């Protein structure tokens, strides 16, 4: 039993809700919140810009130190950093950005990072300003993640479309 409330169950291990991931994180304080990161951990917009704003820019300060030490992530890769006031940990995961020409096959590799964590709160990788089809992102998620994932979809219209079209 966990504290996630109001989710629709899609499969044995995947759940979905129309919610602002920022507000959902502040209430649940999950062990792991997933960020829709880029390789530079520049949290300017989308989910990343919103999460970073909620930390009063502390996520960005920590991220800049991480990059100065380690260099950029790989597309499809991840790193674990602090969750600040939102969660114990933040798993920064880089899905391919279609508006940059990155290979969509890398989306499965990106979701594989979730399997290193028993329970996560997450957005749909490569959705939104990353330019991929969110319906496809949900399919790859369900077919790749085996741990317990709670998906927050900001747009109510998109949430309804994702549920109504889910196979
Ligand atoms: O933001 C992403 O990277 C991906 C995804 N974000 C969220 O669902 C989300 C969840 N919680 C809080 C917030 C967001 C967005 C900003 C604040 C997304 C958003 C809108 C859209 F039209 C498509 C889409 F895929």
Question: What is the number of structural domains in the chain?
Answer: 1
Q: Which atom of ligand 1 is nearest to the CA of 36?
A: 3
Is 1 among the domain residues? Answer: no
Neighbours of 121 (CB within 10 A): 26
Write the CATH number for 111. Answer: 3.40.220.10
Q: Is 159 in the pocket of ligand 1 (CB under 6 A)?
A: no
CA of 33 to the centre of ligand 1 (A): 13
Structural domain of 66: 8-163
Whether the CA torsion 123, 93, 86, 120 is positive or negative: it is: positive
Identify whether 3 is part of a domain. no
List the determination method: X-ray
Q: Is the CB of 145 inside a 6 Å radius of any atom of ligand 1?
A: no
Exposure string over 9-29, b if 16+ CB within 10 A, otherwise e: ebeeebbbbbbebbebbeebe
DSSP3 helix / strand / coil % (the chain, rounded to 5): 40, 20, 40
Ligand 1 atom closest to 153 (CA): 8
Is 2 domain-assigned? Answer: no
């Amino acid at each position: 039993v966990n504290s996630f409330s109001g989710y629709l169950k899609l499969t044995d291990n995947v759940y979905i809700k129309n919610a602002d991931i920022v507000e959902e994180a502040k209430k649940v304080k999950p062990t792991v919140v997933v960020n829709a990161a880029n390789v530079y951990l520049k949290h300017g917009g989308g989910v990343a810009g919103a999460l970073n704003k909620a930390t009063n820019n502390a996520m960005q300060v920590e991220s800049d130190d991480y990059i100065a030490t380690n260099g950029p992530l790989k597309v499809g890769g991840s790193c674990v950093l602090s969750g600040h006031n939102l969660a114990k940990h933040c798993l920064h995961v880089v899905g391919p950005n279609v508006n940059k020409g990155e290979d969509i096959q890398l989306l499965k590799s990106a979701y594989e990072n979730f399997n290193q964590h028993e329970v996560l709160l997450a957005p749909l990788l490569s959705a939104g300003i990353f330019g991929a089809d969110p319906i496809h992102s949900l399919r790859v998620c369900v077919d790749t993640v085996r741990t317990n994932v709670y998906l927050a979809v900001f747009d109510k219209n998109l949430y309804d479309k994702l549920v109504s079209s889910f196979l």
